[PDB]
Nucleic acid binder design. Structure first.
Ligand SMILES: [Mg+2]
Ligand SMILES: [Mg+2]
Ligand SMILES: [Mg+2]
Ligand SMILES: [Mg+2]
Ligand SMILES: [Mg+2]
Ligand SMILES: [Mg+2]
Ligand SMILES: [Mg+2]
Ligand SMILES: [Mg+2]
Ligand SMILES: [Mg+2]
Ligand SMILES: [Mg+2]
Ligand SMILES: [Mg+2]
Ligand SMILES: [Mg+2]
Ligand SMILES: [Mg+2]
Ligand SMILES: [Mg+2]
Ligand SMILES: [Mg+2]
Ligand SMILES: [Mg+2]
Ligand SMILES: [Mg+2]
Ligand SMILES: [Mg+2]
Ligand SMILES: [Mg+2]
Ligand SMILES: [Mg+2]
Ligand SMILES: [Mg+2]
Ligand SMILES: [Mg+2]
Ligand SMILES: [Mg+2]
Ligand SMILES: [Mg+2]
Ligand SMILES: [Mg+2]
Ligand SMILES: [Mg+2]
Ligand SMILES: [Mg+2]
Ligand SMILES: [Mg+2]
Ligand SMILES: [Mg+2]
Ligand SMILES: [Mg+2]
Ligand SMILES: [Mg+2]
Ligand SMILES: [Mg+2]
Ligand SMILES: [Mg+2]
Ligand SMILES: [Mg+2]
Ligand SMILES: [Mg+2]
Ligand SMILES: [Mg+2]
Ligand SMILES: [Mg+2]
Ligand SMILES: [Mg+2]
Ligand SMILES: [Mg+2]
Ligand SMILES: [Mg+2]
Ligand SMILES: [Mg+2]
Ligand SMILES: [Mg+2]
Ligand SMILES: [Mg+2]
Ligand SMILES: [Mg+2]
Ligand SMILES: [Mg+2]
Ligand SMILES: [Mg+2]
Ligand SMILES: [Mg+2]
Ligand SMILES: [Mg+2]
Ligand SMILES: [Mg+2]
Ligand SMILES: [Mg+2]
Ligand SMILES: [Mg+2]
Ligand SMILES: [Mg+2]
Ligand SMILES: [Mg+2]
Ligand SMILES: [Mg+2]
Ligand SMILES: [Mg+2]
Ligand SMILES: [Mg+2]
Ligand SMILES: [Mg+2]
Ligand SMILES: [Mg+2]
Ligand SMILES: [Mg+2]
Ligand SMILES: [Mg+2]
Ligand SMILES: [Mg+2]
Ligand SMILES: [Mg+2]
Ligand SMILES: [Mg+2]
Ligand SMILES: [Mg+2]
Ligand SMILES: [Mg+2]
Ligand SMILES: [Mg+2]
Ligand SMILES: [Mg+2]
Ligand SMILES: [Mg+2]
Ligand SMILES: [Mg+2]
Ligand SMILES: [Mg+2]
Ligand SMILES: [Mg+2]
Lengths: 110, 195, 117, 134, 59
RNA sequence: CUCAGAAGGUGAGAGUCCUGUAGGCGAACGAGCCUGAGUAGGUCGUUGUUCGUGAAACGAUGACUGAAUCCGCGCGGACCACCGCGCAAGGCUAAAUACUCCCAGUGACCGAUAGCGCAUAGUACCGUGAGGGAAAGGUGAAAAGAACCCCGGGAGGGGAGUGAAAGAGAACCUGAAACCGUGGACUUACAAGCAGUCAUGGCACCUUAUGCGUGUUAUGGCGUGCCUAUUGAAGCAUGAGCCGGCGACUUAGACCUGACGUGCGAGCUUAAGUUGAAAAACGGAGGCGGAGCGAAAGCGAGUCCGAAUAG
RNA sequence: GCUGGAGAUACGCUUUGACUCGGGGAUGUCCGAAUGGGGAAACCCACCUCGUAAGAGGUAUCCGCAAGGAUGGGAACUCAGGGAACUGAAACAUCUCAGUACCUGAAGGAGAAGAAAGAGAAUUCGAUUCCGUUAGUAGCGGCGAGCGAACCCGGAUCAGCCCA
């Protein structure tokens, strides 16, 4: 049944990266990446979020009520923008350390 | 019969133009065949009980109170086999060469009655870069509001190709009636082998 | 390439069904019994068309002598004396004048009366 | 313009769809159906009734060269032994014989496998000759 | 067909079909009249429509 | 920007957002004097190839016999002579050929009665067994999948809320028809009917629409379902409960024969294949006209029957 | 980042490089050619050897001196032993269906075939297989239904090597 496997299930950005909402609601809001799920997409960022009425049945308290929690997202938003912009940064480079690769566009690192 | 090239006239263009202006009948005979030949024959159909899966016999003929039919693999049955379905055909044949020759003659002549372009020394492409192709065409009156068919040698000059639209490369005279007729205009570039 | 029957039959059927309106019971609602009855209707339409002509003729006539006999004549006599006078080519829908215009039809009667006998 | 490309004006019709009112319900009426036996039929066919034994054989058969072809039209150019192309013999692998059809007085030299004596009459009587292999 | 091959039903220049003559053939002749030596080549094209496709490579 | 414009994903249709694509690179470990004897040859029983015992050659064996050695031997369709072609009774051998469990790519192939039987199942179910054998789909862009209140044991629904939409709420895309109902309009309880049709009146309506109107209805005239099968069908002769969907004149071949159309036309055309494919050229082996008559030899604008000419 | 589809709470594991790979290994219970012996598959009962129990190894036939080889399983394809009938002939015996279906055996990724006691009628060709063509031609046949070559030529591929 397909499902998000269209991209090569390689993820741009990373676990902690700061990033901008591309399209969608908000759009240009930012947040540190909370959860990255390569298979299914599903970026968790500090941005747009929905009020979740929690399931009435519970072992602890009758409770329910409504948590705020999170709204997960696709590759629908941007990736790790350095140069004071919402730029989509293609290039990698072997620069700085001879180990890591730092994606930049008009600029360096990220 | 009348053309000025990119390097300046090649000694002149004459060739010939099978008057009256082309012909639509003989043309359409060609392209019909053309597409017909290139057509890939393929079909999925299940015939009857050999090709479907049923086997055996059914409730028995007389005295069941219901209809006669002896098997479930037959066309009159849902989930059954199919009668007169498509099979893996061919659709190919040999159009008489006389007409195949005559076809694109007419078709080349169809571009001559209208806008027609031939070139030598199109070297302005400057390797490939695809951009100088856009310039070379632009300097030559090719807007991009027309779809062009580039036919030539010198693969570098072809290696700049395939624009947002309108640009189609057709190497070293594999030219056919279809492609040149479907396009807005044609650039045969090199007049060599177009002798 | 298969081409299924889709969206063709349904439109045609409904096209028939809609012709059937005041049709009683199954006649209106289900196609097969609706389609035929139109078969028979064809017979009733085409034929009744040239018949209403017949009907009306006998209706006009039926009026004419009703008026004629009121004056002591009859359709046969009246139509003849009116014919026996080239004067009145009146003929068609003479009944209108018979029913609606009594004083008129009378003068029309005596003309027939006179130019006959 | 590809879309402007027209028909042939009566190159050909569509086939026959036998499913409809107006022209359907076809074949014969009875016993004309589900078929595949047919051809010629009966009691005792004419063929079997008719006599023969005869032969088959068909040995040597000759490529004909019409005499009018050489003389008069063209140059009467002395077709020689193998003219072949530009001349009328094609399939060959069979001997060639020269027969009298058309005639004029002009010289000729013909190499053939055989010829009619009444043709070979007119070959020399116009001047020239017909030669045969040893 | 192979039937009319050494048999009758010969085609001609015009395409017409040639029939031999039957009665009598190799037996039961006797009698008198010429007629014995009078069974020759003959034809009709009425039936012959159906005899063309039976053997046409040759005449 | 383009050596990259193929393609799929992203809240709706992106060349420049993502994955990609053109192009470039890439591994330790991997994987590509002789020369054939119980035989050739034969007789009997048979069979193979076009070979049906036929004038039956030759191969091949079941049963009986049973040779020559090169101043030899087998074949050339009974057999003989001449003339030729070939050396049996020892074996092995890549390549061009076939098929598709399996992987890839493409499609004037299907799109949930289609396509494989299965949008997974040889499962459910049937059979002691061999064996046979199903139907199958869709919330949303995202679960944000409905905390909370109300009636009810529940089921189920009414709110609130989320969402563009709950006219998507989990018996979740569209949702036709048969079939069941609710409300309204005009109608119906002395009337004999294939259910209609025609004419007029009555009531109601007014978005192709105030007329040649739509809907309904009363009254009058007319009026023997449909199909098949038949000399003849409303037939008390066949078929059908109704609606949906499935469902029947096709494809093949260097085939045959006609018509129309086209290109070359005293000529016309290639097949297998080779090469090149974002496309086609190449390929004369062969085929069809071109001469007929005869049983055939054969002869030839002639031929055939025959001594001629009569045909 | 991960902690199979599994969707669900928990315990967690991971830059000392997880997970997902690509490629070698290592363990691989019992049944099944099953093969220690038995046996209504996947369970019962044994003998020998190394030994501290735990446990590991062996114990079927067939070719051979031995190394070693063979049993069994394959969708269709190949070759071989065996070999139908319906049907057609407008009935039916020869004939056709057809050496098709099925059965059995063997084998491989292919197989079969092959290096002229040949084809043939030019004193020509030149192992085999395959395609086109010859050609519905020669012929076969209750001379019925119907069956139906090869040689020349054009192609695909082209190798001949060894023993008595
Ligand atoms: Mg019943
Ligand atoms: Mg199916
Ligand atoms: Mg489709
Ligand atoms: Mg009527
Ligand atoms: Mg009248
Ligand atoms: Mg009147
Ligand atoms: Mg058709
Ligand atoms: Mg018609
Ligand atoms: Mg019938
Ligand atoms: Mg009859
Ligand atoms: Mg019948
Ligand atoms: Mg049948
Ligand atoms: Mg036949
Ligand atoms: Mg003849
Ligand atoms: Mg896209
Ligand atoms: Mg834009
Ligand atoms: Mg020897
Ligand atoms: Mg022998
Ligand atoms: Mg014998
Ligand atoms: Mg016999
Ligand atoms: Mg023999
Ligand atoms: Mg001797
Ligand atoms: Mg002999
Ligand atoms: Mg001989
Ligand atoms: Mg091989
Ligand atoms: Mg299905
Ligand atoms: Mg369904
Ligand atoms: Mg099944
Ligand atoms: Mg089963
Ligand atoms: Mg049971
Ligand atoms: Mg979903
Ligand atoms: Mg519910
Ligand atoms: Mg509830
Ligand atoms: Mg609702
Ligand atoms: Mg809805
Ligand atoms: Mg529920
Ligand atoms: Mg939707
Ligand atoms: Mg729905
Ligand atoms: Mg009420
Ligand atoms: Mg009601
Ligand atoms: Mg009463
Ligand atoms: Mg009443
Ligand atoms: Mg009544
Ligand atoms: Mg009236
Ligand atoms: Mg109103
Ligand atoms: Mg009435
Ligand atoms: Mg019917
Ligand atoms: Mg009767
Ligand atoms: Mg009657
Ligand atoms: Mg009845
Ligand atoms: Mg009956
Ligand atoms: Mg009944
Ligand atoms: Mg055929
Ligand atoms: Mg042909
Ligand atoms: Mg063939
Ligand atoms: Mg023609
Ligand atoms: Mg011409
Ligand atoms: Mg999951
Ligand atoms: Mg990874
Ligand atoms: Mg055991
Ligand atoms: Mg055992
Ligand atoms: Mg063992
Ligand atoms: Mg097997
Ligand atoms: Mg029988
Ligand atoms: Mg029979
Ligand atoms: Mg038999
Ligand atoms: Mg087998
Ligand atoms: Mg084996
Ligand atoms: Mg062949
Ligand atoms: Mg050859
Ligand atoms: Mg060779």
């Amino acid at each position: 049944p397909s499902a998000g496997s269209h991209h090569n299930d390689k993820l741009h950005f990373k676990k902690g990266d700061t990033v901008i909402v591309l399209s969608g609601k908000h759009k240009g809001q930012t947040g540190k990446v909370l959860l990255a799920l390569p298979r299914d997409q599903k970026v968790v960022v500090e941005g747009v979020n929905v009020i979740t009425k929690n399931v009435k049945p519970s072992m602890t308290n009758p409770q329910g009520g409504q948590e705020q929690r999170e709204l997960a997202l696709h590759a629908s938003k941007v990736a790790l923008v350095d140069p004071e912009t919402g730029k989509a940064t293609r290039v990698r480079k072997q620069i700085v350390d001879g180990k890591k690769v730092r994606v930049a566009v008009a600029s360096g690192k990220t | 019969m009348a053309q000025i090239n990119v390097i300046g006239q090649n000694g002149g263009r004459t060739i010939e133009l099978p008057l009256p202006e082309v012909n639509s009948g003989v043309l359409h005979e060609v392209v019909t065949w053309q597409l017909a030949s290139r057509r890939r024959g393929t079909a999925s159909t299940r015939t009857r009980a050999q090709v479907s899966k049923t086997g055996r016999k059914m409730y028995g003929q007389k005295g069941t109170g219901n209809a006669r039919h002896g098997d479930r693999s037959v066309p009159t049955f849902v989930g059954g086999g199919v009668a007169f379905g498509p099979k893996p055909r061919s659709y190919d044949y040999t159009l008489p060469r006389q007409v195949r020759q005559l076809g694109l003659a007419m078709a080349i002549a169809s571009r001559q009655e209208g806008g027609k372009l031939v070139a030598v020394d199109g070297f302005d492409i400057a390797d490939a870069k695809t951009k100088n192709f856009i310039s070379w065409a632009k300097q030559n009156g090719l807007d991009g509001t027309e779809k062009v068919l580039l036919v030539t040698d010198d693969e570098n000059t072809r290696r700049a190709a395939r624009n947002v639209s309108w640009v189609s490369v057709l190497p070293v005279a594999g030219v056919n009636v279809y492609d040149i007729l479907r396009h807005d205009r044609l650039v045969i570039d090199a007049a060599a082998l177009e002798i | 390439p298969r081409a299924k029957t889709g969206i063709v039959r349904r439109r045609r059927h409904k096209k028939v069904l809609k012709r059937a309106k005041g049709f009683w019971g199954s006649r209106s609602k289900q196609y097969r019994n609706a389609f035929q009855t139109l078969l028979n209707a064809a017979t009733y339409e085409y034929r009744d068309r040239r018949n209403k002509k017949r009907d009306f003729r006998r209706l006009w006539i039926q009026r004419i002598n009703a008026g004629a006999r009121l004056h002591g004549m009859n359709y046969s006599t009246f139509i003849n004396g009116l014919k026996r006078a080239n004067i009145d080519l009146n003929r068609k829908v003479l009944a209108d004048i018979a029913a609606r215009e009594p004083e008129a039809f009378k003068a029309l009667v005596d003309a027939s009366r006179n130019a006959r006998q | 313009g590809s879309r402007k490309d027209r028909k042939r004006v009566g190159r050909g019709p569509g086939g026959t769809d036998k499913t409809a009112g107006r022209g359907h319900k076809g074949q014969k009426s009875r016993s004309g159906a589900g078929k595949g036996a047919f051809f010629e039929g009966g009691r005792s066919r004419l063929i079997a009734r008719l006599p023969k034994r005869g032969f088959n054989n068909v040995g040597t058969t000759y490529e004909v060269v019409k005499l009018s072809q050489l003389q008069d039209l063209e140059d009467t150019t002395f077709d020689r032994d193998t003219l072949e192309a530009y001349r009328l013999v094609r399939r060959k692998n069979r001997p060639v014989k020269l027969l009298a059809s058309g005639e004029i007085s002009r010289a000729v030299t013909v190499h053939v496998d055989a010829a009619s004596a009444a043709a070979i009459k007119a070959v020399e009587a116009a001047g020239g000759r017909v030669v045969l292999p040893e | 067909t192979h039937k009319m091959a050494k048999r009758r039903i010969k085609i001609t220049g015009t395409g017409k079909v040639m029939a031999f003559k039957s009665g009598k053939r190799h037996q039961n002749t006797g009698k008198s009249g010429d007629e014995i030596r009078g069974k020759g080549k003959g034809f009709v094209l009425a039936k012959a429509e159906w005899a063309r496709m039976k053997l046409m490579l040759p005449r």
